[model samples]
Target chain A: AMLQGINHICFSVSNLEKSIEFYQKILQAKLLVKGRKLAYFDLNGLWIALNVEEDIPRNEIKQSYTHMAFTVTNEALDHLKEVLIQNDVNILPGRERDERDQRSLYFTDPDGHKFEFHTGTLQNRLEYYKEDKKHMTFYI
Target chain B: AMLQGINHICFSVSNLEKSIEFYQKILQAKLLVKGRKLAYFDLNGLWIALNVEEDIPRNEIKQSYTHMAFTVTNEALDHLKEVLIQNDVNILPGRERDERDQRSLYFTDPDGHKFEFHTGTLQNRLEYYKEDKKHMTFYI
Candidate 1:
């Protein structure tokens, strides 16, 4: 495969700590790294990086660049719903709960980036390469 | 180790093929993967994915949600400048080049999402978790 998969997404935030808190406490994303100028979070397998003021033009208006969807088991959906509601994270009903899948919800981060958490979806594990050499690497 | 570094960023685009052409021809990002709804590009270790959409709702005043950057060698920088100009991609003067190892330039994608190409910056190779762990794991 010429293209492996997504590596990370970068966002500019006025306050790195606030964004970190939002992802951590509300969305339940794990905080991965915190540097003077940057902070990163792990959303399922995706990475979200927040760059502080000096790194981004502060005057620019903020918008949601992309929407991320997460896969969960049916039993975990209710817990996710409770956690989101308790954290004051607005949850909206998704298109529809599939007959096969139990539930789905959509919400936005503090930065207005949309994300979806759902149960019952097929998972696709793509191939990987290191510097043009194919390799079979697994992460638990 | 609590957090893995960046994984990838995704952007919503009005057209996938046009955006791919721009990134491939003008920006020189390697086309890594393609799917029905998504396309992926590798710029150094960072991955950028573009999602096709028929309509994108803009903020009352248009704003961008995220920006991406890459580190490039001085030789690659020179080549990129020539290619961007030749293709009529808007080129913005970048920050003053410091004694640091890299030089940079900034440009926008077909959807007006901002990105920068630079060389001589640091890379964080952080990984999260052991594959079987249900939770995230990160190591510096």
Candidate 2:
């Protein structure tokens, strides 16, 4: 069988306290287990864990395109953007390859992990791809 | 709402062709769009995209505990382990902090991206934490 749904995502953070506070207050994640080494959170059915590492890599700027995006309503994204700014979060400008891309607010977490609050889905993205007449291979 | 759910995850890879083949065959991901700059896959319901980047931070060995885990049946995990070994995947040893933790198969993809095939749920993990008497804060 192919891979099932996502189980969880873990990130190594330099400080668990700061990371936990951000995810809890900023993202409103429900903390499940707070331990010395790791903390678990239930973020709207997405189980994300923060593991404390004394020497995890940290970058002041975005170094790669690797990122995890969370879904947000079109209206919610606007309000969320304002909330991010008020909390002193480093919100990056949007990047649109196609004009049809939904609203996106890119930001970096305390540990420099890139995250996106997007108002789009797979169906929407595929529909826009057709505009380019891009022949994409489909395999299931 | 904090985050409704995960929209998608994107990773920058040195060779999109190699990644496309690996995800398509090894992980058995459903290819949605294959392009020069990026390739999209529908692994179950999770939309994962591999973007081509000439230079991506690549480490031959495991550098951190950060990883994304996919859910799999306990039986499927063993079979997947065998398949990974057959496909010449770098399978890492298991790290168990608690005896009640579920089964997990850790491996590194071609681009040094760590991934795990896990067989557990948030409820199960929370139940186990109760035994350890771990105090965790919950906020929704």
Candidate 3:
């Protein structure tokens, strides 16, 4: 074991209360910890935390921290889509079936940081990556 | 639970080779999957992946997606500082002892993504957050 698992994953959000409300009400994540500036939600077993910071980092190439994806059941995925749509949350197009599977969708918080609800798992990605290295994305 | 922890965390990096080298050699992460555009490394319980992209996001403020922290032992933390120094990796100053404990250090990868090797845990943060809410940075 080279390194232990992720201690936590966090992002910067513009409004703490707004973000908290979205995560709590929309995602139904268990709020384990909170403060004026930051909060932590237990998304299943992982600790996803965020802080209120207006100026988050940005890169020209779509951002390298592409997204932090959470595993979702088919039912939950559909439910989330509906919830987001009804609430007028910024939702991105669903991924191609061949790309990230039809069950995957992208959404962003007010800060532009992308999040994903995907049916794919790490093992699924590893298998796919090895099955056809040529067709994936980049190689150099 | 609505979500099953974290499926994966990926970032876009300008240089694939440099990032892979840093994660493999410097961080000692196991390269689980590899492709031209993307690579996945198993950091024990967590999976860290990177995609080769020219426009990785950047911001002026210390990012809140701020950083992904790995839990390490006291000895490991000390050892990493040495490893980073020896590798000529850019390492930021340590966090305040009371704020994040003395065992935590922040650094950026080649693509401008910040990371941390923290000796703290979710429990530690929760307890600390509860102990003193006013002195904390943000509460709203």
Interface RMSD over true interface Cα atoms for each candidate: 10.8, 3.2, 5.2
lDDT of 3 by residue, B28-132 (tens): 877776667778877665677887766534554344446777778888888888888888887877544785443687887876567888787877776766676
**Model 2 chain A lowest lDDT segment of ten:** A131-140
Query: Highest DockQ among the candidates is held by which one?
Result: 2
lDDT of 2 at B66: 81
The candidate, 1 or 2, that scores higher on DockQ is 2
> Which is the better candidate, 1 or 3, if ranked by lDDT?
3
Give the lDDT of residue B71 in candidate 2. Answer: 88
Question: Number of clashing pairs, model 2?
Answer: 0
Q: What does the lDDT read for residue A72 in candidate 2?
A: 88
Model 2: colliding residue pairs: none
Q: Score the docking of each candidate (DockQ).
A: 0.14, 0.61, 0.53
TM-score of chain B of each: 0.66, 0.88, 0.80
User: Candidate 1, DockQ to 2 decimals?
Assistant: 0.14
lDDT of 2 by residue, B1-140 (tens): 65788899998788888888888767788788887788998888889999887775565225677898988998898899889988899888878657578888988778778898988887778777775654555432
Residue-wise lDDT of candidate 1 within A1-140, one digit each (tens)?
A: 22223445577666777778877876566677677656767666666677665333433223334655566655666777788888888565565433543456677766566666655322122332222323322221
Fnat values, one per model, are: 0.13, 0.76, 0.69
lDDT of each: 0.58, 0.81, 0.71
